[PDB]
Short mmCIF file of C-alpha atoms and ligand atoms in Angstrom, two decimals:
data_model
loop_
_atom_site.label_atom_id
_atom_site.label_comp_id
_atom_site.label_asym_id
_atom_site.label_seq_id
_atom_site.Cartn_x
_atom_site.Cartn_y
_atom_site.Cartn_z
CA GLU A 10 0.00 0.00 0.00
CA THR A 11 2.87 2.30 0.93
CA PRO A 12 6.06 2.19 -1.16
CA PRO A 13 9.18 1.17 0.79
CA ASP A 14 11.81 3.62 1.84
CA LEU A 15 15.16 3.45 0.03
CA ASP A 16 18.29 4.68 1.90
CA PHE A 17 17.71 8.34 3.23
CA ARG A 18 20.31 9.70 0.76
CA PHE A 19 17.42 9.61 -1.71
CA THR A 20 15.91 12.52 0.13
CA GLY A 21 18.80 14.70 -0.98
CA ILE A 22 18.19 13.42 -4.56
CA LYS A 23 14.67 14.86 -4.29
CA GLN A 24 15.98 18.19 -3.08
CA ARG A 25 18.52 18.24 -5.93
CA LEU A 26 15.79 17.64 -8.53
CA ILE A 27 13.18 20.22 -7.61
CA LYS A 28 14.28 23.75 -6.58
CA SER A 29 12.28 25.33 -3.66
CA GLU A 30 11.23 28.22 -5.87
CA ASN A 31 9.63 25.74 -8.30
CA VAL A 32 7.61 23.72 -5.77
CA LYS A 33 4.38 25.66 -6.30
CA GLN A 34 4.65 25.47 -10.11
CA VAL A 35 5.49 21.74 -9.99
CA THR A 36 2.44 21.09 -7.78
CA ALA A 37 0.19 23.03 -10.18
CA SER A 38 1.71 21.09 -13.08
CA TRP A 39 0.95 17.73 -11.37
CA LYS A 40 -2.68 18.71 -11.06
CA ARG A 41 -2.88 19.76 -14.78
CA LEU A 42 -1.16 16.44 -15.63
CA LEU A 43 -3.73 14.26 -13.90
CA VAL A 44 -6.57 16.06 -15.58
CA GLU A 45 -4.92 15.45 -19.03
CA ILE A 46 -4.11 11.84 -18.14
CA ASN A 47 -7.77 11.08 -17.34
CA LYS A 48 -8.94 12.57 -20.61
CA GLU A 49 -6.27 11.08 -22.91
CA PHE A 50 -5.93 7.62 -21.26
CA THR A 51 -9.68 7.26 -21.33
CA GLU A 52 -9.62 7.91 -25.08
CA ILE A 53 -6.85 5.32 -25.49
CA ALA A 54 -8.77 2.69 -23.52
CA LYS A 55 -11.90 3.30 -25.61
CA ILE A 56 -10.07 3.15 -28.98
CA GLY A 57 -7.87 0.14 -28.27
CA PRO A 58 -4.99 -1.23 -30.41
CA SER A 59 -5.65 0.90 -33.52
CA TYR A 60 -4.40 3.85 -31.38
CA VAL A 61 -0.84 2.65 -32.02
CA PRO A 62 0.71 4.39 -35.00
CA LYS A 63 1.06 2.09 -37.95
CA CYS A 64 2.26 2.55 -41.50
CA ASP A 65 3.50 0.65 -44.51
CA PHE A 66 7.13 0.33 -45.42
CA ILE A 67 6.28 1.83 -48.82
CA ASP A 68 4.99 5.05 -47.19
CA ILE A 69 8.64 5.77 -46.12
CA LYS A 70 10.11 7.92 -48.90
CA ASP A 71 13.67 9.31 -48.82
CA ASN A 72 14.33 7.50 -45.51
CA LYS A 73 11.82 9.71 -43.65
CA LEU A 74 8.65 8.96 -41.88
CA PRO A 75 5.82 10.93 -43.52
CA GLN A 76 4.69 13.98 -41.58
CA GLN A 77 1.46 12.51 -40.20
CA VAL A 78 3.24 9.33 -39.03
CA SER A 79 6.06 11.38 -37.44
CA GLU A 80 3.66 13.50 -35.52
CA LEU A 81 1.76 10.51 -34.20
CA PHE A 82 5.03 8.64 -33.38
CA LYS A 83 6.44 11.54 -31.36
CA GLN A 84 3.17 11.75 -29.33
CA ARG A 85 2.56 8.08 -28.87
CA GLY A 86 6.13 6.80 -28.71
CA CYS A 87 5.60 3.53 -30.65
CA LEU A 88 5.19 2.56 -34.32
CA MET A 89 4.42 -0.58 -36.27
CA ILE A 90 5.80 -0.58 -39.85
CA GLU A 91 4.18 -3.21 -42.01
CA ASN A 92 5.72 -5.22 -44.84
CA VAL A 93 9.38 -4.41 -44.18
CA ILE A 94 10.38 -8.00 -45.09
CA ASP A 95 8.67 -10.50 -47.44
CA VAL A 96 6.91 -13.40 -45.76
CA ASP A 97 8.92 -15.97 -47.62
CA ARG A 98 12.15 -14.52 -46.33
CA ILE A 99 10.80 -14.39 -42.82
CA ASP A 100 9.87 -18.07 -43.01
CA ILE A 101 13.36 -19.05 -44.12
CA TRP A 102 14.93 -17.04 -41.28
CA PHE A 103 12.54 -18.49 -38.66
CA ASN A 104 13.23 -22.04 -39.83
CA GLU A 105 17.02 -21.47 -39.82
CA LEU A 106 16.82 -20.06 -36.26
CA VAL A 107 14.85 -23.05 -35.02
CA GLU A 108 17.34 -25.42 -36.72
CA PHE A 109 20.21 -23.60 -35.11
CA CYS A 110 18.58 -23.78 -31.69
CA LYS A 111 17.87 -27.53 -32.07
CA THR A 112 21.50 -28.23 -33.11
CA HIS A 113 23.12 -25.96 -30.48
CA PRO A 114 21.81 -26.72 -27.01
CA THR A 120 15.33 -28.48 -23.98
CA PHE A 121 13.36 -27.30 -27.05
CA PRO A 122 10.96 -25.58 -26.58
CA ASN A 123 12.62 -24.08 -23.51
CA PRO A 124 10.72 -23.02 -20.38
CA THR A 125 11.06 -19.27 -20.81
CA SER A 126 10.47 -18.64 -24.55
CA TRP A 127 13.87 -16.92 -24.82
CA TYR A 128 16.78 -18.28 -26.92
CA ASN A 129 20.30 -16.91 -26.25
CA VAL A 130 21.39 -16.88 -29.85
CA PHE A 131 23.03 -13.57 -30.86
CA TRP A 132 25.17 -13.89 -34.04
CA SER A 133 23.37 -16.46 -36.25
CA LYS A 134 23.18 -15.98 -39.97
CA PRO A 135 19.48 -15.06 -39.93
CA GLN A 136 20.21 -12.42 -37.28
CA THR A 137 23.09 -10.93 -39.24
CA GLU A 138 21.06 -10.99 -42.40
CA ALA A 139 18.00 -9.43 -40.74
CA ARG A 140 19.92 -6.68 -39.07
CA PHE A 141 21.49 -5.64 -42.30
CA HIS A 142 18.69 -6.17 -44.75
CA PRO A 143 18.37 -2.98 -46.87
CA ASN A 144 14.76 -2.52 -45.75
CA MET A 145 15.89 -2.79 -42.13
CA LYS A 146 18.72 -0.30 -42.56
CA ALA A 147 16.16 2.01 -44.18
CA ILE A 148 13.72 1.99 -41.28
CA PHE A 149 16.48 2.68 -38.79
CA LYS A 150 17.63 5.62 -40.94
CA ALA A 151 14.06 6.96 -40.93
CA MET A 152 13.71 6.53 -37.12
CA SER A 153 17.03 8.26 -36.49
CA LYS A 154 15.60 11.43 -38.09
CA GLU A 155 12.96 11.68 -35.37
CA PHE A 156 15.75 12.31 -32.83
CA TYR A 157 18.08 15.32 -32.74
CA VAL A 158 20.59 17.33 -30.87
CA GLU A 159 20.89 21.05 -30.61
CA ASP A 160 24.56 21.32 -29.77
CA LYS A 161 25.81 19.70 -32.93
CA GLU A 162 29.29 21.12 -32.59
CA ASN A 163 30.07 19.29 -29.35
CA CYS A 164 27.55 16.58 -28.52
CA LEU A 165 29.29 13.22 -28.98
CA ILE A 166 26.62 11.41 -31.02
CA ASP A 167 26.16 10.43 -34.64
CA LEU A 168 22.54 9.64 -35.34
CA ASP A 169 23.41 8.70 -38.90
CA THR A 170 25.15 5.60 -37.66
CA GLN A 171 23.44 2.45 -36.36
CA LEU A 172 25.47 0.13 -34.12
CA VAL A 173 24.56 -3.42 -33.31
CA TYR A 174 23.71 -4.28 -29.76
CA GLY A 175 23.52 -8.11 -29.79
CA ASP A 176 20.18 -9.37 -28.62
CA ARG A 177 18.29 -12.57 -28.59
CA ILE A 178 15.19 -14.11 -30.02
CA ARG A 179 11.82 -15.06 -28.52
CA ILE A 180 9.76 -18.00 -29.74
CA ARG A 181 6.71 -18.10 -27.44
CA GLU A 182 4.45 -21.17 -27.72
CA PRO A 183 0.72 -20.89 -26.93
CA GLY A 184 0.07 -21.47 -23.31
CA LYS A 185 3.33 -19.96 -22.17
CA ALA A 186 2.35 -17.44 -19.53
CA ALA A 187 4.31 -14.38 -18.39
CA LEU A 189 6.99 -9.61 -16.27
CA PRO A 190 4.75 -6.61 -15.40
CA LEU A 191 4.45 -3.01 -16.76
CA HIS A 192 7.80 -1.30 -16.65
CA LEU A 193 10.41 0.94 -18.15
CA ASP A 194 13.83 -0.49 -19.14
CA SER A 195 16.92 1.77 -19.46
CA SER A 196 17.37 1.74 -15.67
CA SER A 197 15.48 1.52 -12.40
CA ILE A 198 16.60 4.59 -10.40
CA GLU A 199 19.08 6.38 -12.78
CA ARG A 200 16.55 8.77 -14.37
CA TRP A 201 16.42 10.48 -11.01
CA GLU A 202 19.81 9.70 -9.51
CA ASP A 203 22.26 10.32 -12.33
CA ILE A 204 23.11 13.95 -13.02
CA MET A 205 23.00 13.96 -16.83
CA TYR A 206 20.11 11.43 -16.94
CA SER A 207 18.01 13.61 -14.69
CA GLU A 208 18.74 16.69 -16.75
CA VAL A 209 16.87 14.98 -19.65
CA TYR A 210 13.71 15.57 -17.51
CA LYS A 211 14.48 19.16 -16.37
CA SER A 212 11.27 20.61 -17.95
CA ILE A 213 9.22 18.23 -15.83
CA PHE A 214 11.07 19.07 -12.60
CA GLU A 215 10.54 22.78 -13.26
CA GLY A 216 6.78 22.52 -13.65
CA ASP A 217 6.65 22.65 -17.42
CA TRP A 218 6.06 18.96 -18.42
CA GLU A 219 4.09 20.22 -21.38
CA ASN A 220 7.27 21.29 -23.04
CA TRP A 221 9.28 18.06 -22.39
CA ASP A 222 10.81 16.88 -25.69
CA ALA A 223 11.55 13.11 -25.65
CA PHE A 224 13.55 13.37 -28.84
CA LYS A 225 16.23 15.83 -27.83
CA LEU A 226 19.42 13.99 -27.01
CA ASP A 227 21.93 16.62 -25.87
CA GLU A 228 21.90 15.56 -22.23
CA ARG A 229 20.92 11.89 -22.71
CA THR A 230 24.10 11.32 -24.77
CA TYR A 231 26.00 11.61 -21.49
CA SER A 232 23.58 9.82 -19.16
CA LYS A 233 24.82 6.88 -17.08
CA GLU A 234 22.11 4.27 -17.18
CA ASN A 235 23.99 2.15 -14.60
CA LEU A 236 25.58 3.84 -11.62
CA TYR A 237 26.13 0.58 -9.80
CA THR A 248 18.69 -7.35 -15.69
CA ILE A 249 21.02 -4.52 -16.91
CA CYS A 250 21.36 -3.61 -20.60
CA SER A 251 24.81 -2.15 -21.26
CA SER A 252 23.96 -0.09 -24.38
CA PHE A 253 22.21 3.31 -24.75
CA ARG A 254 19.25 2.48 -26.99
CA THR A 255 16.97 5.33 -28.17
CA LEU A 256 14.40 2.80 -29.29
CA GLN A 257 13.61 -0.78 -28.48
CA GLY A 258 12.37 -2.91 -31.31
CA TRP A 259 11.82 -6.18 -33.02
CA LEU A 260 11.08 -7.90 -36.29
CA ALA A 261 7.98 -10.11 -36.45
CA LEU A 262 8.75 -13.76 -37.41
CA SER A 263 5.10 -14.82 -36.92
CA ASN A 264 1.50 -13.66 -37.39
CA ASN A 265 -0.22 -13.02 -33.97
CA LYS A 266 -3.41 -11.03 -33.33
CA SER A 267 -3.61 -8.40 -30.48
CA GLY A 268 -3.33 -10.14 -27.12
CA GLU A 269 -1.81 -13.39 -28.49
CA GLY A 270 1.48 -13.45 -26.66
CA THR A 271 2.65 -10.10 -28.04
CA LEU A 272 3.44 -6.66 -26.61
CA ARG A 273 1.34 -4.16 -24.67
CA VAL A 274 2.24 -0.50 -24.48
CA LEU A 275 1.02 2.79 -23.02
CA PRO A 276 1.08 4.86 -26.18
CA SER A 277 1.43 8.28 -24.62
CA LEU A 278 5.08 9.25 -24.18
CA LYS A 279 5.00 12.72 -22.64
CA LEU A 280 2.15 12.12 -20.21
CA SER A 281 3.74 8.86 -19.17
CA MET A 282 7.09 10.34 -18.25
CA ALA A 283 5.62 13.48 -16.61
CA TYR A 284 3.70 11.12 -14.32
CA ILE A 285 6.55 8.68 -13.69
CA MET A 286 9.17 11.34 -13.00
CA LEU A 287 6.96 13.22 -10.60
CA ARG A 288 5.44 10.18 -8.89
CA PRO A 289 8.14 10.02 -6.09
CA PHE A 290 7.03 13.52 -5.15
CA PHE A 291 3.26 12.82 -5.42
CA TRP A 292 3.04 9.20 -4.40
CA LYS A 293 0.27 9.75 -1.78
CA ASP A 294 -3.16 9.82 -3.41
CA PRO A 295 -5.64 11.76 -1.29
CA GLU A 296 -8.64 10.16 0.41
CA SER A 297 -10.89 12.87 -1.00
CA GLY A 298 -10.23 11.81 -4.65
CA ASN A 299 -9.87 15.50 -5.29
CA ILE A 300 -6.85 16.31 -7.52
CA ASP A 301 -6.62 19.71 -5.84
CA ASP A 302 -5.65 17.96 -2.54
CA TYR A 303 -2.27 16.48 -3.69
CA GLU A 304 0.74 18.01 -1.92
CA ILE A 305 4.39 17.57 -2.70
CA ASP A 306 6.58 15.21 -0.74
CA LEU A 307 10.16 16.49 -0.75
CA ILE A 308 11.28 14.49 2.25
CA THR A 309 10.72 10.68 2.28
CA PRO A 310 13.27 8.67 0.24
CA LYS A 311 10.43 6.89 -1.65
CA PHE A 312 11.12 6.12 -5.31
CA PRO A 313 8.30 3.72 -5.99
CA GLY A 314 8.93 0.71 -8.27
CA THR A 315 12.74 1.11 -8.08
CA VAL A 316 15.47 -1.30 -7.05
CA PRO A 317 18.70 0.64 -7.27
CA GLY A 318 21.26 -1.34 -9.28
CA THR A 319 18.73 -3.05 -11.56
CA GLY A 320 17.64 -2.20 -15.12
CA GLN A 321 13.88 -1.94 -14.81
CA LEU A 322 11.51 0.47 -13.23
CA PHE A 323 8.36 -1.35 -12.22
CA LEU A 324 5.01 0.36 -12.78
CA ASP A 325 2.64 -2.35 -11.67
CA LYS A 326 2.11 -1.32 -8.03
CA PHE A 327 2.40 2.44 -7.32
CA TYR A 328 1.57 3.99 -10.72
CA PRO A 329 -2.22 3.40 -10.88
CA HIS A 330 -3.15 6.27 -13.19
CA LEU A 331 -1.11 4.59 -15.93
CA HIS A 332 -3.14 1.44 -16.05
CA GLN A 333 -6.12 2.81 -17.96
CA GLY A 334 -3.83 3.60 -20.86
CA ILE A 335 -2.38 0.16 -21.50
CA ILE A 336 -3.31 -1.51 -24.76
CA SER A 337 -2.16 -4.38 -26.89
CA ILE A 338 -0.41 -3.57 -30.10
CA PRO A 339 -2.35 -4.11 -33.40
CA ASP A 340 -2.40 -7.52 -35.06
CA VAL A 341 1.20 -8.42 -35.97
CA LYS A 342 2.06 -9.80 -39.41
CA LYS A 343 5.37 -11.56 -40.43
CA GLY A 344 7.87 -8.99 -41.60
CA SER A 345 6.52 -6.03 -39.68
CA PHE A 346 8.86 -4.12 -37.40
CA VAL A 347 7.73 -2.70 -34.08
CA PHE A 348 9.56 0.22 -32.36
CA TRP A 349 8.99 1.80 -29.02
CA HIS A 350 10.73 4.73 -27.28
CA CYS A 351 13.12 3.84 -24.47
CA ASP A 352 10.81 5.72 -22.07
CA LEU A 353 7.58 3.98 -23.10
CA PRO A 354 5.86 1.81 -20.48
CA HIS A 355 5.34 -1.66 -21.87
CA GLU A 356 4.82 -5.32 -20.89
CA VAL A 357 4.26 -8.65 -22.67
CA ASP A 358 0.89 -10.34 -22.74
CA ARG A 359 0.22 -12.51 -19.63
CA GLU A 360 -1.28 -15.25 -21.75
CA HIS A 361 -0.89 -16.65 -25.26
CA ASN A 362 -4.04 -18.30 -26.43
CA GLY A 363 -3.38 -17.75 -30.05
CA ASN A 364 -3.06 -20.35 -32.82
CA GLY A 365 0.75 -20.60 -33.18
CA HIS A 366 4.11 -19.40 -31.98
CA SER A 367 4.60 -15.70 -31.26
CA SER A 368 8.25 -15.14 -32.33
CA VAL A 369 10.35 -12.07 -32.74
CA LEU A 370 13.94 -11.04 -33.34
CA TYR A 371 14.98 -8.23 -31.03
CA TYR A 372 16.91 -5.30 -32.57
CA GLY A 373 17.03 -1.82 -31.04
CA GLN A 374 18.29 1.48 -32.17
CA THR A 375 21.75 2.08 -30.76
CA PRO A 376 23.39 5.25 -32.13
CA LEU A 377 27.08 5.76 -32.42
CA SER A 378 27.59 7.75 -29.23
CA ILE A 379 29.98 8.20 -26.37
CA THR A 380 28.20 5.76 -23.97
CA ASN A 381 28.00 3.19 -26.84
CA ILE A 382 31.74 2.90 -27.55
CA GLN A 383 31.94 0.02 -25.03
CA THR A 384 29.11 -1.64 -26.86
CA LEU A 385 30.87 -1.22 -30.20
CA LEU A 386 33.96 -3.00 -28.63
CA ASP A 387 31.89 -5.77 -27.09
CA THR A 388 30.08 -6.49 -30.33
CA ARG A 389 33.37 -6.68 -32.24
CA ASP A 390 34.92 -8.95 -29.59
CA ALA A 391 31.89 -11.23 -29.19
CA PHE A 392 31.29 -11.71 -32.88
CA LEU A 393 34.99 -12.33 -33.65
CA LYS A 394 35.13 -14.90 -30.78
CA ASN A 395 31.65 -16.39 -31.51
CA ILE A 396 30.46 -15.93 -27.89
CA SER A 397 27.62 -14.04 -26.11
CA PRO A 398 27.75 -10.27 -25.74
CA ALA A 399 28.72 -9.15 -22.30
CA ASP A 400 25.29 -8.72 -20.79
CA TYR A 401 24.64 -12.43 -21.35
CA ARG A 402 28.18 -13.81 -21.32
CA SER A 403 28.56 -12.52 -17.72
CA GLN A 404 25.80 -14.87 -16.55
CA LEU A 405 27.47 -18.10 -17.84
CA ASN A 406 29.69 -20.44 -15.82
CA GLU A 407 33.12 -21.58 -16.99
CA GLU A 408 31.62 -24.74 -18.65
CA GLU A 409 28.86 -22.82 -20.49
CA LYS A 410 31.43 -20.21 -21.57
CA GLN A 411 33.65 -22.88 -23.12
CA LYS A 412 30.71 -24.67 -24.72
CA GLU A 413 28.75 -21.82 -26.39
CA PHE A 414 28.75 -21.25 -30.13
CA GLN A 415 26.86 -18.26 -31.70
CA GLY A 416 26.81 -18.84 -35.43
CA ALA A 417 29.03 -15.85 -36.29
CA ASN A 418 30.27 -15.76 -39.80
CA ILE A 419 32.05 -12.84 -41.28
CA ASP A 420 30.69 -13.88 -44.68
CA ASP A 421 27.06 -13.25 -43.44
CA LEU A 422 28.00 -9.59 -43.61
CA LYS A 423 28.29 -10.03 -47.35
CA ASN A 424 31.48 -7.93 -47.39
CA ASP A 425 29.27 -4.79 -46.95
CA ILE A 426 31.49 -2.09 -45.44
CA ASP A 427 28.64 -0.17 -43.83
CA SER A 428 27.46 -3.37 -42.08
CA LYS A 429 30.92 -4.18 -40.86
CA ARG A 430 31.18 -0.65 -39.35
CA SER A 431 27.97 -1.36 -37.45
CA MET A 432 29.62 -4.46 -35.92
CA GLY A 433 32.82 -2.73 -34.90
CA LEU A 434 34.82 -4.54 -37.63
CA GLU A 435 35.82 -1.55 -39.77
CA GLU A 436 36.83 2.02 -39.01
CA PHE A 437 34.32 4.82 -39.67
CA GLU A 438 34.73 7.06 -42.65
CA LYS A 439 34.84 10.80 -41.85
CA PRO A 440 34.20 12.77 -45.06
CA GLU A 441 36.06 16.10 -45.75
CA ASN A 442 32.79 17.89 -45.18
CA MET A 443 31.83 16.37 -41.87
CA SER A 444 32.44 18.19 -38.57
CA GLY A 445 31.20 18.70 -35.06
CA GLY A 446 30.25 15.97 -32.64
CA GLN A 447 29.46 13.62 -35.48
CA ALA A 448 33.09 13.82 -36.72
CA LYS A 449 34.43 13.65 -33.21
CA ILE A 450 32.50 10.51 -32.14
CA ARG A 451 33.63 8.75 -35.26
CA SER A 452 37.23 9.59 -34.46
CA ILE A 453 36.88 8.48 -30.83
CA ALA A 454 35.41 5.14 -32.01
CA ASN A 455 38.23 4.65 -34.45
CA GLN A 456 40.74 5.32 -31.68
CA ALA A 457 39.03 2.77 -29.48
CA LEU A 458 39.01 0.23 -32.28
CA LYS A 459 42.80 0.83 -32.70
CA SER A 460 43.69 0.56 -29.02
CA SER A 461 41.01 -1.96 -28.08
CA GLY A 462 39.98 -0.08 -24.91
CA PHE A 463 38.02 3.02 -23.89
CA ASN A 464 37.19 4.94 -20.77
CA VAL A 465 33.93 6.84 -20.73
CA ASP A 466 34.22 8.80 -17.43
CA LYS A 467 36.30 11.67 -18.75
CA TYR A 468 33.61 12.63 -21.27
CA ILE A 469 30.78 12.27 -18.76
CA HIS A 470 32.61 14.30 -16.08
CA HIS A 471 33.28 17.06 -18.64
CA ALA A 472 29.56 17.23 -19.66
CA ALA A 473 28.41 17.43 -16.11
CA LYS A 474 30.95 20.16 -15.29
CA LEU A 475 29.81 22.10 -18.29
CA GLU A 476 26.40 22.25 -16.53
FE1 FE B 1 11.03 -4.30 -21.33
#
């Protein structure tokens, strides 16, 4: 009923985040927020899955989302793109994955997750021209203002190795949450600056797509994903109707994060039910749904105003791609009472950026050694480590130079004309590929001082 206390240091986190002079404004903003939430989340609940933005791969011209799709995607924080990959190609990839899993050990496994990272179908999927295209189009929804200095190149996609899911009917399920850290959004300096507009009482002007500060955020100050992903995503390897062992989302990005970020300050709902009776809590170290040191923020217990907004995604067809913003609440369906396997291949957007240089190095090292990337490799014992085989084949990259750069296998080109942070991050990556090591702290410390 009451969220637990964390250590009392978290009280000083609260007093760092909201300035005394802004307390009145923040309180007013929380009341405005709840009124908007009840209106908009009601509409979502009454519309259902068609609320999620959806478009056809052919609608993407010149590697840009059309204007109407863009506008809906920035509001709703998720998108389903249909017909990215032909069904026949999808079938071949699915069958090759299953073969690989059956020849490289129980099948089906208990959890519906298969720790295969570098198989040929994965490498081919990741680098299919239609897949590169949709990532290019997504990358144009994000931006930075300080182009001269911010160490990010949104024109470059890196590979973060991830696994596959093949969920049989009857396999039950991990509640509503955010990934990309449990407590960091509040605790880290640069991460919390992402949400400054909310902490100042102006949630309405929070821009989820501006990356100047997030570029330097530490998602792990201490279940953990080691890369900075702007978007989570996956490619559909099966046809499954809404609710059949798929994904559920809360398709309202700004309202979601205004509520989440302020919830530690307004965690006590009043007995009156009158929104005008909330009052700020700047004292208790309560950060509901958090477990410092873990990767997920849980929303299933102390975030009740969110629940009305949760919907299944639209019917999924083979060869559709589904994206959601790193800040979008989501969960998987509890049950799968559909007619066949619900299977996806996970692939997120991971820009070339200062907090992703370690990822670039891990990907290069794991693929070259045919082992798990670090986030999974670190959970294996000595025997498992010596046994695993990941299907990595340089030739699956089809000697495409751009693909090899995504995998950390080739230095980045820096054209005569290119400058600013884009040129600089490419150079820093190249230096790391030459030396084989990197230390992020210097860059982070400099960004935070510059504050
Ligand atoms: Fe998740």
